[PDB]
């Protein structure tokens, strides 16, 4: 007698059911004189076929579709072998007999009426095995309950899950890939390899031998336009160099040895790794979620809870739960739409490059000797973006020439966005390759590289804007921003240098922009440098 | 068996039902749709034949148009027409049986790299942790190392050469000749040794001709092509030199005899095969004995080495079990005369393989959403109201 | 940066190189309570994907030829399957995260002018793997360096192997087969299965599976006319019953459990058994042949940038000294048998004009 409402329902009594009278059909093993015996099986084919017990209201197709939609899809899993094994050690002087049976997941579809069940269709899905052992001596009489089972039962914990049937991101405009961690599992035991009950003194094992290399990655995009499985896969290959997506040859196995005075229950699930492909621009504009299969997760129940009551429960809403460590690894990526022009010659001091319509583009370059360089275009506009290539310079090397490694992983160095005119100063090493993104058909705005001779070293890795308040794309905390321009402060995000027209001096220091009151009137054209200490807002304004 | 009728040329490339594969080992790629297990449809024209043919090499009665099946709309119409024809075939018990046999009749797989079909080698994995007293080094799981090690020859390769998709049949559009249904094999060597190979089919469902007082249902032509492919799948293709007389060229002022291959006669049905294939058999060749012997050898191999093995997936094993349930004589005795009675379809029955000489064909356009349904021609095979095609002015005529 | 003479050179830095941005692409595993987690790989090696990084002067063909000329071939010899495993036991009350990546051998070709590397090309060849583990409580903050590697690094071996790219026998006349020992390995790590670095408190295993009828011996004959591979194989079977097919069904594995103090480095090579087939006519050796049959491998334990020169082609024996000599009946001659035993006297009539063998047995022990 259920306490729910009328109508049909989908019920999952859970895993760990053993049918009646199918106990010794698989046979048993006998061990003696301190030997060790290992039995096991591989749930692959001819043994992974579910058993249907339907009722006229609920036919086989109805049951299959309804359970697969809500709970784990077993039809797909029926082709991927999974192996389990029990190991047991006999004592010094005695005999041991151990026999194996299969454990099934039990699903029921019911038709409640007036708080009374008037129909029940059952599905048994093979999941794993269960080994029962006993040490004996000749002539001993064994309780019939040890061999024979008259009715089905749940050796594991009973359950009655059912479902009625009806922060500030200081990034730059561009793409990014965020690895959010490993150990993601769908709700409602939808990604459960299976559960094993290990009796005292034994040792269970669950192995994914990758006998078939197939996998089931999951994809979810907020906009099918500009994004797709192929597009995200290519972007990941560019970023993380992922070569195999729907394939794998890595095995994962879990082993637990139960103590001598207790029983253990180990649950094995398949895990996933989450890759978010954002398209931040000014405010996330698009998002995709890629769940690449990982090498599984194992939970260990020290023992089933004492039998008190089978409390009914409802299925959780479809989603994910993370069991592994929390992480967020962000990697930039080159947008394939923009074109990248490679410079065949290494760049020395005092170099010029002719812009060669209004679409943004990329230029790849490397320096001849490590140092600080100033990049400014004709009339100090348009503003540019400077990214560093990750992992470059640890491979192919040709003196006095660029040998690109096709590394598409770009780490933002410094940039600003539109119409604002500014010039960048960045420290570059000889080996590493660097990309420059140029937006925006008037006269070509040639890009000029100048190797500063230890003059602007103070304003290292910063963009100077050629400029009463003014705001611009703020950098991350611990980064530097600079302006070339009697009060100055910060609006939400929380220094003075004298220029010689081209020497430099120190006018003021320890200038807290988060003060709102700045009366210096320093006896020095000046440079105001701000180092972000708390990215309280997307943009930082100097007023 | 369920024909997937929920696909379109705009369907996304999901790498599971809609794929972009490579044509043999050439530099071209083409898009394929799976409408059933190991059965694919490729609306685009066949890659093999070159679309531009010199006027000298054009054959009589052929229609050439290099712009046909170039736009996406025509491709989608072709795909939907093929699906409709397949549904019409599967609507009957005979068609369902034939399609199931086609799907299950995979080419025999090659043995392990080392050789043989008996059993793979073993490996151990997962050494247990060092216990308090016992090292437990040998406590580990046992695995069949090359699981599913059986090498297969029926697969389409992706453009990246890093993925493979099972396929027994691939229905293409017409080649250089717009109206010429054809069936070609993947490997000639494997089509005669009993191992078998995948088949490719060129089909044109949008054109038909009128014989006597009725129209020709393209489903019969498709069934003929599938039956011919069955020979390739079972690897029982006879040598090209095993021909038989078919007609005496009376019109000529010389003693010349036209010849036909044995497969074409056995498959095309009609009255011609009745004079041959008698009891007792008056025509015989070593081909039949060799085919029966090789088929028995392969069946013995499966029964003594394949069934016992427990280190290979059932996808191949169960299909091979059903593949050998039937006998070669059943295939040899399978012809269009049986499906004509089953489907109640009228077709040419006398010298139907040499109709080009007897009378010239007039072709009619078929609109499939309208003129042809899952039950065949709308309003019957006789009263269907079709329109003469505009391509009849481009028929080649070389007397 | 280089003390070598000017010119072009080929260098090997050894296995154990891990690429950047490729840490978690193979996934990971989570362990709880006292459970023990084992993760590994088992490849047929049929599918090989070496990563090239060439230069104008050094193209793909140049690299492949100049590398396989000295070091191990990876095109056709990249067929032997490989397998490795790592296992970790989690503490009583905590959670463990393990993530696995591949390890590669880094080959290089360089052009040195004026004692400075002015051009460099790179090749990465897959070789085994490496597992990183961390015990984490929920919500613990993890340093990004544990997940993301932003530069290639050498984990196991830091080496630099370069090469310039420019007794009285009182025997009798007749055949002989000599088993000269076991454990032979080619020089310059041409047989190296690979090296594994097991962190403290973990265990590691290297497996060497074998496909049936897929074993390649090494044959070197001084006269292909007489000592052909078939001929020497037949003589080997006659002397010892050696058959190649039985070495393909075998399998071996090496296991090492590092303590909680330091890490353990295990290096594993494939081995060979050396059989010398000789003809000893007139007291000299008119012909000779060497046949190296696959063995069950060899292992050593290391404990962790001097330049070294590639050694000359040859073999090194790590097994015990051994020399077992067995004669064999020359197949050229014919063998006749005397059915009746010699009791106390016999006069056998010769049944040719060519040398031959007579096989007989004694019906009673004694001096004849």
**d(Cα C42, Cα C208) in Å, to the nearest integer?**
9
**d(Cα A350, Cα A446) in Å, to the nearest integer?**
13
Task: Spell out a b/e string for C339-365, using b for 16 or more CB atoms within 10 Å of the CB, else e.
Answer: eeeeeeeeeeeeeeeeeeeeeeeeeee
What DSSP designation does A52 have?
Answer: E
Q: Which residues contact B345 (CB under 8 A, 6 or more apart)?
A: B217, B219, B220, B339, B376, B381
Strands C356-359 and B169-172: unpaired
Contact A295 C42 (CB under 8 A): no
**d(Cα A236, Cα A273) in Å, to the nearest integer?**
13
Kindly state whether C65 is in contact with chain B, defined as any CB-CB distance less than 8 angstroms. Answer: no
Cα C322 from chain centroid?
20
Residue by residue, DSSP assigns A403-471 as -------EEEEEE------EEEEEEE-SSS-EEEEE----S---EEEEE--SSSGGG-SEEEEE---EE
Contact B59, B397 (CB under 8 A): no
Q: Which residues contact C150 (CB under 8 A, 6 or more apart)?
A: A390, A391, C20, C21
> CB-CB: which of C203, C249, C257 is closest to B121?
C249
Q: Which residues of C touch B127 (CB under 8 A)?
A: 38, 85, 87, 203, 205, 255
CB atoms within 10 A of CB B77: 19
Contact C211 B130 (CB under 8 A): no
Q: Which residues contact B208 (CB under 8 A, 6 or more apart)?
A: B215, B216, B217, B218, B363, B364, B366, B386
**d(Cα C45, Cα C79) in Å, to the nearest integer?**
5
CB atoms within 10 A of CB C367: 3
Rg (CA), chain C: 28
Q: Which residues of C touch A399 (CB under 8 A)?
A: 118-119
Q: Which of C11, C19, C32 to mutate to test the interface with A (most CBs of A within 10 A)?
A: C32
| Among candidate residues B117, B244, B263, the one with its CA nearest the CA of residue B192 | B263
Contact B115 C44 (CB under 8 A): no
The tokens for A2 are 């259920």
Strands A470-473 and A539-542: antiparallel
Shortest CA distance from A229: residue in chain B:
B14
Q: Which residues contact A191 (CB under 8 A, 6 or more apart)?
A: A72, A185, A269, A270, A271, A272
SS3 C131: strand
Contact A256 C35 (CB under 8 A): yes
From residue B187, alpha-carbon distances to B32, B165, B269, B337, C46 in Å are: 20, 18, 26, 29, 24
The tokens for A463 are 């963009």
Cα C257 from chain centroid?
23
C-alpha dihedral, A297 to A300 to A304 to A305, nearest 10°: -100
Q: Is the peptide bond before A382 cis (omega within 30 degrees of 0)?
A: yes
Residue by residue, DSSP assigns A455-524 as SSGGG-SEEEEE---EEEEPPPTT-EEEEE-----BSS---EEEE----EEE---S--STTS--------
Q: Give the resolution in Å.
A: 2.9
Question: Any idea which residue has 């009749």 for tokens?
Answer: B105
Handedness of CA C89, C91, C97, C101 (dihedral sign): negative
Q: Is the peptide bond before B280 cis (omega within 30 degrees of 0)?
A: yes
Partnered with residue A256 across adjacent β-strands are: A204
SS3 sequence of chain B: CCCCCCCCCCCCCCCCCEEEEECCCCCCEEEEEEEECCEEEECCCCCCCCCCCCCCCCCCCCCCCCCCCCCHHHHHHHHHHHHHHHHHHHCCHHHHHHHHHHHHCCCCCECCCCCCCCCCCEEEECCCCCCCCCCCCCCCEEEECCCCCCECCCEEEECCCCCEEECCEEEECCCCCCCCCEEEECCHHHHHCCCCCCEEEECCCCEEEEECCEECCHHHHHHHHHHHHHHHHHCCCCCCCCEEEEEECCCCCCCCEEEEEHHHHHHHCCCHHHHCCCCCCCCCCHHHHHHHHHHHHHHHHHHHHHCCCCCCCHHHHHHHHHHCCCCHHHHHCCCHHHHHHHHCCCCCCCCHHHHHHHCCCCEEECCHHHHEECCEECCCCCCCCCEECHHHHHCCCCC
Q: Which residues of C touch B125 (CB under 8 A)?
A: 38, 40, 42, 83, 85, 207
The tokens for B248 are 């005496």
* Contact residues, C window 225-284, toward B, CB-based 8 Å cutoff: 248-249, 251, 253, 255, 257
CB atoms within 10 A of CB C139: 7
Exposed / middle / buried, residue B399 (Cβ in 10 Å: 0-12, 13-18, 19+): exposed
Angle at C51 between CA C210 and CA B151, to 5 degrees: 40
The tokens for A224 are 């099918």
**If interface means Cβ-Cβ distance under 8 Å, which residues of chain B face chain A?**
12-15, 125-126, 128-129, 131, 134, 139, 141, 143-144, 147-148, 163, 313-315
SS3 sequence of A329-392: EEEEECCCCCEEEECCCCECCCEEECCCCCCCEEEEECECCCEEEEEEEHHHCCCCEEEEECCC
Give me the phi and psi of C191, to 5 degrees please: -110, 0
Q: Which residues contact A439 (CB under 8 A, 6 or more apart)?
A: A360, A382, A383, A384, A417, A418
**If interface means Cβ-Cβ distance under 8 Å, which residues of chain A face chain B?**
36, 38, 40, 44-46, 79, 81, 83, 85, 87, 89, 203, 205, 207, 209, 211-212, 228-230, 246, 251, 253, 255, 257
Q: Which residues contact A344 (CB under 8 A, 6 or more apart)?
A: A401, A402
> CB-CB: which of C27, C49, C119 is closest to A293?
C27
| Among candidate residues A253, A256, A251, A230, the one with its CA nearest the CA of residue A242 | A230
**d(Cα B175, Cα B198) in Å, to the nearest integer?**
18
Handedness of CA A490, A493, A494, A496 (dihedral sign): negative
Exposed / middle / buried, residue C142 (Cβ in 10 Å: 0-12, 13-18, 19+): middle
| Among candidate residues B222, B356, B192, the one with its CA nearest the CA of residue B287 | B192
In terms of phi and psi (left: phi > 0; alpha: psi -120 to 50; beta: otherwise), the region of B132 is alpha
Contact B141 A85 (CB under 8 A): yes
> CB-CB: which of C36, C87, C209 is closest to B145?
C209
C-alpha dihedral, C118 to C123 to C128 to C129, nearest 10°: 60
**d(Cα A411, Cα A435) in Å, to the nearest integer?**
9
Segment (H or E) for C237: helix C229-240
Residue by residue, DSSP assigns A136-174 as E-TTPPPPHHHH--SS-EESS----EEEE--------SS
> CB-CB: which of C28, C43, C55 is closest to A182?
C28
Exposed / middle / buried, residue A85 (Cβ in 10 Å: 0-12, 13-18, 19+): buried
> CB-CB: which of A89, A211, A230 is closest to B13?
A230
Rg (CA), chain B: 24
């Amino acid at each position: 007698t259920i306490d729910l409402a009328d109508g049909n329902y989908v019920v999952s009594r859970g895993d760990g059911w053993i049918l009646s009278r199918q106990n010794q059909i698989l046979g048993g093993s006998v061990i003696s004189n301190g030997s060790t015996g290992i039995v096991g099986d591989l749930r692959v084919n001819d043994n992974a076929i579910p058993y249907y017990y339907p009722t006229p209201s609920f036919n086989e197709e109805y049951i299959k579709n309804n359970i697969q939609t809500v709970f784990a899809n077993f039809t797909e899993a029926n082709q991927i072998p999974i192996g389990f094994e029990f190991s047991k050690t006999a004592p010094s002087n005695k005999n041991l007999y151990m026999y194996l049976q299969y454990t099934y997941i039990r699903y029921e579809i019911i038709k409640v009426l007036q708080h009374e069940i008037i129909e029940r269709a059952v599905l048994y899905v093979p999941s794993l095995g269960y080994v029962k052992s006993i040490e004996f001596n000749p002539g001993e009489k064994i309780n019939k309950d040890f061999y024979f089972l008259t009715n089905d039962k749940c050796i594991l914990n009973e359950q009655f899950l059912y479902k009625k049937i009806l922060r500030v991101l200081p990034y730059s405009n561009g793409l990014y890939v965020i690895n959010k961690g490993d150990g993601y599992i769908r709700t409602n035991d939808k990604d459960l390899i299976g559960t094993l009950l290990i009796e005292a003194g034994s040792s269970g094992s669950i192995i994914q031998p990758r006998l078939r290399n197939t996998t089931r990655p999951l994809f979810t995009t907020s906009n099918d336009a500009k994004f797709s499985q192929q597009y995200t896969e290519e972007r990941l290959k560019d970023a993380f160099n992922v070569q195999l997506f729907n394939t794998s040859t890595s095995l994962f196995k879990f082993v637990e040895e139960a103590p001598s005075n207790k029983n253990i229950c180990i649950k094995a699930y398949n895990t996933y790794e989450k890759y978010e492909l954002i398209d931040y621009q000014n405010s996330i504009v698009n998002k995709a979620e890629y769940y690449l299969p990982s090498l599984g997760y194992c939970e260990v129940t020290n023992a089933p809870s004492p039998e008190s009551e089978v409390v009914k429960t409802q299925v959780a809403e479809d989603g994910f739960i993370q069991n592994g460590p929390e992480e967020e690894i962000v990697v930039g990526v080159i947008d394939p739409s923009e074109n990248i022009q490679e410079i065949n010659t290494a760049i020395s001091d005092n170099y010029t490059y002719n812009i060669p319509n209004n679409n943004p583009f990329y230029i790849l370059f490397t320096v001849n000797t490590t140092g600080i360089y100033k990049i400014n275009a004709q009339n100090n506009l348009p503003s540019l973006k400077i990214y560093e290539a990750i992992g470059s310079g640890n491979r192919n090397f040709q003196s006095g020439n660029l040998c690109d490694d096709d590394i598409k992983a770009i780490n933002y160095i410094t940039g600003f966005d539109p119409n604002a005119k500014s010039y960048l100063v960045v420290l570059l090493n000889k080996d590493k390759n660097y990309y420059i993104r140029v937006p925006q058909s008037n006269i070509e705005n040639q890009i000029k590289f100048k190797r500063e001779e230890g003059d602007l070293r103070n304003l290292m890795n910063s963009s100077v804007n050629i400029i009463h308040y003014y705001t611009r794309q703020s950098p991350d905390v611990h980064d530097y921003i600079s302006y070339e321009f009697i009060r100055l402060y910060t609006s939400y995000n929380q220094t003075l240098f004298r220029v010689t027209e081209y020497n430099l001096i120190n006018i003021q220091q320890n200038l807290n922009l988060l003060n709102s009151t700045k009366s210096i009137r320093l006896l020095n054209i000046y440079i105001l440098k701000v180092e972000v200490t708390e990215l309280n807002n997307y943009n930082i304004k100097l007023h | 068996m369920n024909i997937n009728d929920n696909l379109s040329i705009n369907s996304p490339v999901d790498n599971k039902n809609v794929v972009v594969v490579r044509a043999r080992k050439t530099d071209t790629v083409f898009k394929a749709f799976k409408v059933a297990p190991n059965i694919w449809v490729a609306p685009e024209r066949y890659y093999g034949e070159s679309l531009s043919i010199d006027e000298e090499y054009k054959v009589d009665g052929g229609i050439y148009d290099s712009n046909f099946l170039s736009q996406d709309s025509e491709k989608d119409k072709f795909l939907q027409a093929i699906i409709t024809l397949l549904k019409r075939i599967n609507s009957t018990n005979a068609g369902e049986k034939l399609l199931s046999l086609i799907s299950t009749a995979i080419p025999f797989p090659y043995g392990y790299i080392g050789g043989g079909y008996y059993a793979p080698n073993m490996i151990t994995f997962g050494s247990a942790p060092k216990s308090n007293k016992k090292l437990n080094s040998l406590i580990s799981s046992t695995i069949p190392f090359p699981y599913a090690g059986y090498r297969e020859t029926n697969y389409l390769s992706s453009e990246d050469n890093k993925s493979f998709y099972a396929s027994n049949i691939v229905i293409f559009g017409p080649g250089a000749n717009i109206v010429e249904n054809n069936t070609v094999f993947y490997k000639k060597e494997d089509a005669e040794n009993g191992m078998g190979t995948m088949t490719e089919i060129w089909f044109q469902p949008f054109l038909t001709y009128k014989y006597d007082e009725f129209y020709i249902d393209p489903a019969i032509e498709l069934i003929k092509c599938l039956i011919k492919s069955l020979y390739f799948l079972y690897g029982i293709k006879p040598s090209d030199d095993l021909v038989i007389p078919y007609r005496l060229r009376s019109e000529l002022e010389n003693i010349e005899y036209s010849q036909l291959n044995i497969v074409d006669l056995l498959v095309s049905g009609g009255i011609d095969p009745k004079f041959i294939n008698t009891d007792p058999y008056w025509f015989t060749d070593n081909y039949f004995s060799n085919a029966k012997k090789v088929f028995e050898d392969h069946r013995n191999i499966y029964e003594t080495q394949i069934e016992g093995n427990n280190a290979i997936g059932n996808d191949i094993k169960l299909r091979l079990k059903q593949k050998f349930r039937i006998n070669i004589n059943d295939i040899w005795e399978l012809n269009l005369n049986y499906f004509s009675k089953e489907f109640s379809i009228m077709m040419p029955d006398r010298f139907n393989n040499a109709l080009k000489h007897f009378y010239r064909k007039q072709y009619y356009k078929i609109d499939y959403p309208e003129n042809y349904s899952i039950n065949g021609f709308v309003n019957g095979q006789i009263n269907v109201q079709l329109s003469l095609s505009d391509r009849n002015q481009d028929i080649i005529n070389k007397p | 940066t280089i003390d070598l003479a000017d010119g072009n050179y080929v260098v090997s830095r050894g296995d154990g190189w891990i690429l950047s941005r490729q840490n978690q692409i193979l996934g990971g595993s989570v362990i709880s309570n006292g459970s023990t987690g084992i993760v590994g790989d088992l490849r047929v090696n049929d599918n090989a994907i070496p990563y090239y990084y060439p230069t104008p002067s050094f193209n793909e063909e140049y690299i492949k030829n100049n590398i396989q000329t000295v070091f191990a071939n990876f095109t056709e010899a990249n067929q032997i399957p490989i397998g490795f495993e790592f296992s970790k036991t989690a503490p009583s009350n905590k959670n463990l995260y393990m993530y696995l990546q591949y390890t590669y051998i880094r080959y290089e070709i360089i052009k040195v002018l004026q004692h400075e590397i002015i051009e460099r090309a790179v090749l990465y060849v897959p070789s085994l793997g490496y597992v990183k583990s961390i015990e984490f409580n929920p919500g613990e903050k993890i340093n990004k360096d544990f997940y993301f590697l932003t530069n290639d690094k050498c984990i196991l071996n830091e080496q630099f192997l370069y090469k310039k790219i420019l007794r009285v026998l009182p025997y009798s006349n007749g055949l002989y087969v000599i088993n000269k020992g076991d454990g032979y390995i080619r020089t310059n790590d041409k047989d190296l299965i690979g090296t594994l670095l097991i962190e403290a408190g973990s265990s590691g295993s290297i497996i060497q599976p074998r496909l049936r009828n897929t074993t390649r011996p090494l044959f070197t004959t001084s006269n292909d006319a007489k000592f052909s591979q078939q001929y020497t194989e037949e003589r080997l079977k006659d002397a010892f019953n050696v058959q190649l097919f039985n070495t393909s069904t075998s399998l071996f594995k090496f296991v090492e459990e590092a303590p909680s103090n330091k890490n353990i480095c295990i290096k594993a090579y494939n081995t060979y058994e050396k059989y010398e087939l000789i003809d000893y006519q007139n007291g000299s050796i008119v012909n000779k042949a060497e046949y190296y049959l696959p063995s069950l491998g060899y292992c050593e334990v290391t404990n962790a940038v001097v330049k070294t020169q590639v050694a000359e082609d040859g073999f090194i024996q790590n097994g015990p000294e051994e020399e077992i000599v067995v004669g064999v009946i020359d197949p050229s001659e014919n063998i006749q048998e005397i059915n009746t035993a010699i009791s106390d006297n016999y006069t056998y009539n010769i049944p040719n004009n060519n040398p031959f063998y007579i096989l007989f047995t004694v019906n009673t022990t004694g001096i004849y």
